[model samples]
Target: DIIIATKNGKVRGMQLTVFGGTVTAFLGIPYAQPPLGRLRFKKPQSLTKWSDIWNATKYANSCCQNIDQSFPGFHGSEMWNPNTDLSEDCLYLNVWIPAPKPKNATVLIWIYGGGFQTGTSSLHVYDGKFLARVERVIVVSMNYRVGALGFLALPGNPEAPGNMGLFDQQLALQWVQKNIAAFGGNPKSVTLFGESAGAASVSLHLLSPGSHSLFTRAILQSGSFNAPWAVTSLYEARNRTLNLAKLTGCSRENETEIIKCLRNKDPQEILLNEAFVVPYGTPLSVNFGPTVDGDFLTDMPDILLELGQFKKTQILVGVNKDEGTAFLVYGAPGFSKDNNSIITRKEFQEGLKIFFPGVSEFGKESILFHYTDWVDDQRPENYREALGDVVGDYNFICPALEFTKKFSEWGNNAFFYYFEHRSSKLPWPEWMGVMHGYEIEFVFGLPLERRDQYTKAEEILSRSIVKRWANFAKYGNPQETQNQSTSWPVFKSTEQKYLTLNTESTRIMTKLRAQQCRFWTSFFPKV
Candidate 1:
């Protein structure tokens, strides 16, 4: 046990006995003034100075989030529940360090994912013992408010506005800048990383002026700024929420009145009623994600990337092979047999026309050819996989490639890759492929049990990924080292090379190069 004193008070934290050494870990450390009561929905306040010792052994309660039972491990027996659950006073962070007194060490701050609606940093998968032991780096994870409690954009609330969750993240970074040195971390060498919605949040921060000075490097896995379903405008989101309110028995009253009613309603009831109505893949309705407010986020992510508005920090970006398939499997009611499946070439053309009206004939043909080949000829088992890739490419991977293409042109070192390894036991046909969020275990270097479906080769690939990520944290470049010589090529517009990780060996591939790139770029000509 160790005791650290902060302005708030002295706190006690436990030492984890792992990997032949002691890893000091502190949980539920508040870096900002809690956004409780009147402070709800407002910009976070700095923690008020205190003189007493505050216990920091356990995690704070996560913000308000609806637990989807269908999600793996969500309602399972292994789920973690902080002693105190769901409150406005939920601005807290967790840290793990190999040594508490080192002069300077690299810092890796992880942001967890739940579609911006559900998740906490305290999940078992996010435990940092293995990463700290293997890489000798300081690892930090944090929790922010979620759903309506964190992102509600009411009409007039001087104290708080929408995107309060983002403000909470910004506050966490500020805390690291001030206090991370005490934990042997260098504030100057912070790397921001996230998966899925967490990755999307990191992308937003990369473009946000408020977060420019917080971190110097970024790693985005299975998500990026180029996502077509990126953040929306406050006005648009409010209108959708107002419609939702009408459906949920809260009519269009003044902003404050509606917020009051929303706060009084049962959180579970709200989830049960609104979950299906919002529908999956609708840009506005996907988990009340980040929005483009005039303040924090000035514009959409791709616009900022195209204009070179992001901090000139080193970036490592990539996506899973079947990102959208997970959403289709979990969120769609009958995706396995819906019109979305078995879409004929003619129907595909018509669907593209409806979704992308006014696109040039050439552009429409390019997109249609790119998507229809797999849909029309592929086996039934392969249809969903191809559709998943189509949505993932359009919404995330293509945009990411475009962003990096532009960034490389501006003289920045950016690396890209595609995760394509499947689990051994639960193979692709068994409802799990190279699915979304599969990279978390590897990133954290957690031990995989037999049920995890990872074979020896998969384990080695996992270690390879961890080494690349950890090296990137220590040094901005993830170069091939003595342990591994997989040279991930620098992405170029002319030669669109990307590293493909598999059970056999890591190799470079430019497949789907022209088709995928030209298909999405034609939509945003100016971009």
Candidate 2:
């Protein structure tokens, strides 16, 4: 057990094991005041100082979200949310510090992702114990508001600025800067990273003016501001927020009243309603996620990245080999595996509703050409497997590659990787070729006791990943390991280099999916 003092009060945390040593976990420490009572639908507020020692042994209630089975957008990782009581007053952060912690150990702050809809930092998979204990770095995971509660953008700032989730993350970082030194963490050495929406959060933070000086480096895994779903037009955002207000019986005539009415209305009623959660295949799907706030996200995320408007920090971003497989297999209901084992042209055509609504035949065929094989476009099932691969490329790989290519042109500190390792114990189909999130378990390192489902190869890979991550956190460069031949080269515009992280061995490969990315980048959108 360990007790640490924050600006608020003393917090008591429990000890956990890693590599046979102990790391103290200050779980469920409130970083901000609970966004509840009159604070609902508003930005997170500064937490009041506590007079007594707070028991932080258990994770606090997750930010108000639908992690239960009833939710349609059921993510595989959703099942890992804590069974602890849920509440709207959830703005907590968890910290993992190794015993006999060295001075100024690198700090790795993790942000979780659920399409900006669902996720809680209290989840088991997001645990920082293993990384903190083994890597000997202070690890942190913070929960931000999600769903409608976190991402409501009405007219402008001070009302609903579209990125409350991002602001919540900022507050956590500020807290770290102010209080982490007491926990034996270096205030000057902080690296922020995350997966999916969390990765999107990191990207946003890189662009966010408020996040400057809060982090020394950033790692983005399978998410970016450039991704189509990551940012929406201001018009679209206001439309979605107005609809949410209208659904709650709040008058849209007055933006001020809508904010007031929303602040007073029951949060559960607003969230549990079907209208609150916009299902797939509809224009309303991005109703509660991030949008261009005119101020925060000026034009589009990629446009800002294109102009080199992001924070000048060491950046590492990459994707899993089959990132799209996860999107197709889980997020796409039209292409549902249960709907039809064998795909048909009609099924594939109909499924275009998932991404491109009212897409012309020429449009579909042109996009499909990049993914479809030269041999047989005739058979739908054969095409379906290719589409699965395309799904990864379209959503994650291509966009990220485009961004990395442009971003690396600005500096030599940029690094990229492709995770392609899959253990035999994983149940995902071989055809998917390493589904999304397959690397997360390896990156986080399987829970100490759950190593039975893991592999020694993965165990070594985990060590390598931790070393690389910590190396970046310590110094800006993520160079190769001293003992191993595995290399991580800087991404250059000429070489378009990126590391291929596999169980066999990691290597600095160049021009990852070069031809396809070149084609995709040819007609770059204004976004």
Candidate 3:
């Protein structure tokens, strides 16, 4: 039978054949009450009652966020943004299970990343059809609120506390714990996985007490909670909220009045001010995201991790080879589609200032000296790459590696990987090599969907990734199902080994960017 019963109601899903096997999909199942009217800016509330049968065949509306469809020749400009209808009432999740489902199978819940600004599970790249059928696991993705509507915070205000987006994710996990068994998924064998901002969310869950028992494993792809752009400080969050209120003409003397006005305003109107949080021509910094909300996050993520106060679980975490090229190409106003645009020394220094605005002159100079290529410093073209490296090191790479060390030391099993394969089919410029979010194409088996575009090797790599991911979810070890010769080594304090994921050769590697990582993790902190 393709119909399954959830705590809310009976959901009738659609059956489809994939690779000659049947897969049943239940789409747009509401796990919480719609955050509409007065419910806006509040934590997600569980769905109390739904007596009728739920027709879960179609996708739901993606949460509210600004969409820019103008950029051409950029990979994520079109693909990453939501393709579904947008609305405030978007707390929904989709599920895919193999037909004639195996009992108590592993479950992988996917959380998407959009720099905490824009994303949707409805995108084709995240479709769980192939992953569920091929891996023999139930795959799920959820639509959580994003942008200002999802993260505006006011201290002591219960109605508008920060981290509503994370609350949405936590609620979804709770739903899985209580109801996934009905869909042939083991309630105790859930693995939470995500990319970029979503990866940061996964890390936050690792540190969060509220999310400790929700999942058995986590796979963090290209992000961590300690990344500079991951969280918005309480001070910054309050100011951003105040500015947004002024921008939306909802400003008032009291926080209560301001929140009331904001709630009554148009969702699109509030979203229009999201860009004002960070000024133009500056490096991207999240203005609204998870803060030290007493409920979801008791302390700052870095502080929490440093104290060893976090959930210890099996982890598969890594970063892409060039995680910052896309950020520079899309985030930095000085950059453009034409690779000919050169970053001047002055621009490089200015970029660092914007990223670390409070740093002293010595800190800026120290950062400049370390990132500078001594011999190639004179070449204008070299500076663009230098700036990209700075973004990669400061924003994505070092924090991830540091996280691995602490995560492993805490007695959690951690498998680190580096995705270095650059696909020829991508529409981006050649200079933007192996950019952020590239690994997701393979992880979700998108390559298998359009095999004509990707090379045969890429297809094989995609299958390997799917198998390893499923193996990790099911067995708590990525190499459990693989041969011993090329097994992925764990990230440890002594060896510091990691898998180099490439279509040409997937093999173990040591100390990825050792010198550069040291510069950030060891030296820069003192500066």
Candidate 4:
């Protein structure tokens, strides 16, 4: 057992042996007061100082959200679901520090991704023991509210200002500022990194002046603030919340009455009722997520990025090769299994409508024409691949391109990469090459978890990723240590240079998905 004192109180942590080195893991550290009672829809409250020693050994409850374990064979359903019991009072954080507790170690903070609907820092994949031990850096992750509970916005209403989840993350970052130094972390050297919606959260923080000083650098993996689904307008957020209020048997007369009724209802009832908020044929977009609140988000992310109005921080951002297959399968439950099953041309067209719900009719038709593989249009696999590419390019790939370009244009240091390695251990079909979130395993050094299951090259690649990430956190450059033979080129607005992360052949590339991204970022807007 290890004990550390903090502003709140003293906490006892458990020690574990990782990579033949000792790492002290302090789990379930509360960063905020429980968002219960009158505080349900508002910002997370700062925790009051406690006199008793807090037990930081076991994991805490995950924020309440629907976890449909019914789909047994669904891709990523098992891997992404929370392992802990669900709860409303779940604002907690965890930390892992390497042995000897060296002073001034670099800090890496993680925010998980579940489309801002479901996720927890306590998940097995985010265990920080291996990363802390191997990299000799401090790793921290925080739990934030999700779903309507986290993002239900009542415009101009103080009781129910939206983006409560992002506020929770901000509170945790503040906690690290005051407390991480006790665990041997450098307060000035924090690298915030996340995947999917978590990456979107990181991007939003980069844009928000309220969150700029919390971290010096960021690593956004497979998500961007500019993504269409990342943020909804305040009016849309209000409509979704009011609709949810009606479904949950709460008052919809006005913001005040709605807040009063919803807060009185059972939290679980409100959570399970989120299903009714999802509109028909609109599975591609998230129903409850961050909104352009006047306070947290002063303006839309795209406008802010275009105007060069954000904190210019060093960043490394990228997406997987196939970032849309899982989204396709998840959106259309019927496609979850059986690789032989195919999406027909008509079905693909309908999918395009769902994917671009706000696009004009002419824009949709243009997307249809551009995405279709002319030679293999009749083939089932080809059309399905085309549809997947549509989602991948529109929702992820182009957004990253736009973000990286704009970020670099503003003089911030940037590095971009494309993840092309697919894991054989996944239960997914062969068609889904390097599906979304697959690179997370290698980034966390999971290949070292079970030596027999992974190949020698895979292990080496995992080590390379962990080292690069650690070096970036330490010195603001991925290749600062200069041990690797191939140097990663810095991304620029003009060159668009990027690294290709693959076990078979890793090399530098330029102008990723140039034609497709150009159509989305430049041409499609005119339609």
Candidate 5:
């Protein structure tokens, strides 16, 4: 009984000494009713209280997903990281609580992001044991539904609200509010934090009236709902649903009928047929994710953010330098194996069309001209770094910067940062600097398998990051913390300041890549 005993039931947890202190891990706690069989395609339902002691030991099977592959001539992160656990009954959470419970420990809940198609909380890279022990804060990570099974939107199906994956996360936050107190966590002092797709998800929560008070603050690294892949229009959502329906042999006339038909089929069969293939030369990436239901979102993410229709919570948001390089090395043909190939002006125009469908070729050329140096605009081989900057500006950096301005204008405490630490562990080319998802290793205290490989600088950086994040969660500002108070200034619409997380030192700067973002805003205007 002493091993695990919360208000809901009893759980037997494992213990370990990490970062020189003992901690308890309550692994695999189910927080929602399983989205299986009749529950499929429906909003996440509440879990009934347990009649017996729930076993919180090992991780449950990860949300059902097919193995990600190195496909379409692009070397996905999956080339090195393969998901092994595949199961549908995976609406579970893992919690790490420190020993000698503090009366006011902050909680940092992590949501893993695989572009909303793939990711599991069980990924060792996201382990919170060291972070929890080091920061003396409770850390929680959860598995949400993913792939078509999680985000497929049938516009007319009342049963299918489209944002089921987000709905699952919402339920998890609600569960944390009700139960985190028993784990030495302050429910009122929780921070909703995530990277990539998870970052977008946290941003959605900030906008959702349904989730206004779920967490006191948030941390979004390298993503936002305004990103094209994160939230789509109803037409596209239904279009994607139709694509899946046609493949699943459920192209019934009505929304109600086809949805029921698809529900009867095996979820695994549906996932295998996830139709959004990476068009090698085109801009259509991130095939599966949340959509704008008239309910979850009344309007576009851009309109909402600009209108200041978000929860006014403190925020720490940022992007990785060369964020575009990892994918560009694969998605852009100019990134040659021998670093010999180059992206010509014509090829650049064609690729831009894919990413920005309606833009005229001249418009794309204009973008290229802005990103390119005075002379490098014509030379493909020399312009590879500029090409990566183009991707980073459009996809990650600009949106993050735009959101920082919006949040600050809304009068919320906003902390801005840019991560440029290139890890030796990552397989990036010289042209590519730091990569997407690279900050996660340092933020989570390094992955379990590669603990010994981190450099001394990485060690200092990671510890400092943990402090800032923990301080933000506890006191609502990074500089408010004891360890990282000096250089990180609060972001403001008027000041336009940002912190640079480099390998050498944490320094503050004015308007990161402001010219690049300014260029994109001229044409796209919204992101």
Candidate 6:
């Protein structure tokens, strides 16, 4: 164990006992003053110096959030009781370092996903020890407020406005910059990485002036910056928060009064009540995500990247093949299985219309024909898998590819990949393929020994992915050696190369472009 002094106080951390050995971990370290009581809905305050030592052995209580119903029992059966404490004093961070005195080691910071509404850094699936051990790089994860508490912008709250969760993330990075050296981390060589909403957060930070110097690289999985429904307006987000307040019997007079009344309400009650409102288009509602504030975010991320406004940094970004299947597995209605189990030609045409509004339809029929053959050939048993891929490609993957291309045009280094590993336990019925989030376990390299239900093949796949990810963190490329089987190529617009990571073998594909991506790019023309 090691004790480090910070501006707030002394924090204690311990080393992990695992395969690679001697990986140091610190949990529940406060990055800013607790955003509670009158401080709620305000910009994070600098932590005041303290005389006593602060315990960093356990994780901080998760930020104030309503449990998401998308995967009710997914978080674990023990967390079924949603009546637990949801407080405003939840700004905390965790760190995992390979050594105590590491110099110039690359740092990877993870932000967990729960749509913009729910999630924490304490999930067992997000353990950083394995990556730290394999990659020997510093890994850091942090907690921030979720749902209305973290993003609500009220009429009277002038200090924080909207996206306070993002502000908290920035503060955590600042903490790392000032104190990560004691943990053997190089603050100058930091990469921000995340999934889902967390990936969206990384995109937000890339465009935010407040987060400019915080990180030197980024990795976005299953999400992107210019996705049409990605960015939320402060006005719209506040209205949604007010709707939650009304459901919880809170007055909409001012931000302070509303937060007070809502804070006193039961966490579960709020979650249950808010779940009824269709999240507009997606399965997850509570769309209070990153907004374009003049101070923090000067413009949209895609615009910044296109105009070369972003900080010059290396990047690795990609999306799962079935990015939206998780939504279906959790029983999101409207998707049903039958002989006509695939997305119809009409649906593809409609999607083109919705996504590519005034574009020429010269290639529209061919596009629909290609998608029809693709879906018909791989008929997914879970209707959500098909819909999820459509939505995922339109809203996430396509934008990511376009974003990568734009960055490549600016002479920046970038890598792209497509994860196609499927779970053996839930194997697809011949035609149907891997579902969303199926590749996460492999990416993190969770031990197959612990996965009793998963097969030996899955375990081997996990090992392979873990090695590839470790190699990427170590050398900015997934290839361990020049002769490695899975060789990821740097994305060059001229070659249009992308790595396809699968259970069988990793292959590089060239001249592979999605026309649907062009349609989605038209939605955010200015971006």
Across 280-335, the per-residue lDDT of candidate 5 in tens digits comes to 22333555677777666767788989999989878999999878766664556555
Candidate 6 per-residue C-alpha lDDT over 294-343 given as tens digits, one digit per residue, 9 for 90 to 100: 65677656568779887677678887776644443333343332223454
> All models: lDDT?
0.70, 0.75, 0.85, 0.86, 0.77, 0.68
Across 1-527, the per-residue lDDT of candidate 4 in tens digits comes to: 57899999999999898777799999999999999988999998888999988999999989999885756766466778888889998999999999978799999999998888889998878989989989899999999999989998886787889999999999999999999999999989999999999999999999889888888999999998888778878777877887888887785666798898999989888877776765642555577898888888998788899999988778999999999887676654335555644777788777777677677889988988888847854565776888788889988999998999998998888999999988867667878778888898888888876654987778878888898889888998887255544688899999889998877777989999998998999888687
* Model 1, residue 162: C-alpha shift (Å): 1.4
Model 6, CA-based lDDT? 0.68
User: Stretches of candidate 6 above 4 Å error?
Assistant: 70-86, 99-103, 154-160, 241-281, 284-286, 329-386, 425-432, 448-464, 467-471, 511-513, 523-527
lDDT of 2: 0.75
Model 1, 1-527: lDDT tens digits are 57776546676777887756677888888878877655666778889876767777888877777665543443321243333477666788988888544568889999876767778888877888677766788888888977766666653464336778888899899888888887788999999999877888887888888898999899888776566555656676676567557767777457676666665566665665555434333422354657766677776666777788888877888877766565554333335422445444454455444434456777667665666565456465454454556556776677677767776666677788887876564323444357777667777876333346568786777677778888898888876597757788777756767888776878888733456667667754532
What would the TM-scores of all predictions be? 0.85, 0.92, 0.95, 0.96, 0.92, 0.83
For model 5, the superposed segments whose C-alpha errors exceed 4 Å read 71-76, 79-84, 276-284, 336-359, 375-381, 447-451, 480-485, 525-527
lDDT of 2 by residue, 1-527 (tens): 57788888899988776677888888889988877766776788998899899998988887776653533454443455555676887888999988876688889999988777778887767778888877788999898987778888874757677778888999999999999999999989999989888888898888877787899889988888777667767776676777777777886677877888888887676786524434344321445777777655666776778888878767898898778665565444445434444666555555555656645667676766666556764665675666666566767888788777777777747899999886555554565667776677667766233446666667777777777878888888776468755667788778777898887867778888876766566743311
Clashing pairs in 5: none
| Overall local distance difference test of candidate 5 | 0.77
Reference-based lDDT, residue 506, model 6: 78
How many residue pairs in model 1 have overlapping backbones? 3
User: Where does candidate 4 clash, by residue pair?
Assistant: none
For candidate 4, give the lDDT: 0.86
C-alpha RMSD for every candidate: 4.4, 2.9, 2.1, 1.9, 3.0, 4.8
Q: lDDT tens digits, residues 227-263, model 3?
A: 8788888888898888888888888898888989988
**Highest TM-score against the true fold, candidate:** 4
How well does candidate 2 match the true structure, expressed as C-alpha RMSD?
A: 2.9
Superposition TM-score, candidate 5 onto the true structure: 0.92
